[PDB]
Amino acid sequence: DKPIYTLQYGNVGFVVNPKTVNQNARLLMGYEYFTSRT
Amino acid sequence: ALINPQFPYAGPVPIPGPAPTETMPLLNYRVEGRIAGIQQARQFMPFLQGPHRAVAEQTYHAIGTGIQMGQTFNQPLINTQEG
Numbered sequence: 001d002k003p004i005y006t007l008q009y010g011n012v013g014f015v016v017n018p019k020t021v022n023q024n025a026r027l028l029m030g031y032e033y034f035t036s037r038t
Numbered sequence: 039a040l041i042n043p044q045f046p047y048a049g050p051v052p053i054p055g056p057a058p059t060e061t062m063p064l065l066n067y068r069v070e071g072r073i074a075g076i077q078q079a080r081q082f083m084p085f086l087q088g089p090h091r092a093v094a095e096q097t098y099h100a101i102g103t104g105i106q107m108g109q110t111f112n113q114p115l116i117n118t119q120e121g
Contacts, residue, residue: 006090007089007090007092009083010085010090
């Protein structure tokens with residue numbers, strides 16, 4: 001209902017504060033979005 | 039509607055009806071409503087009112103300096119053709 005859109009309210013970020021981090025840890029991010037074709 | 043003679047539809051719901059209640063009354067509401075908490079002039083946001091740059095142009099400053107100095111080598115003299 002209110003898509004994340006920088007330029008509407010500064011840079012935005014997705015945050016994760018981990019309690020435990022093993023070797024080779026990583027976040028796989030998946031996005032669903034609409035965009036502009038200039 | 040169809041009415042059929044001789045069995046006619048009663049000419050009304052008549053006087054044998056059972057008045058079941060006198061609960062018909064909606065008591066008018068009387069009330070005083072006050073929403074008066076101190077208001078402070080400000081709200082905090084991450085950003086309001088900015089029209090952020092999607093790309094900037096390239097930008098620069100400028101300088102020059104020096105003097106006019108030179109080491110030169112010239113073509114030799116030649117016989118003049120005509121004139």
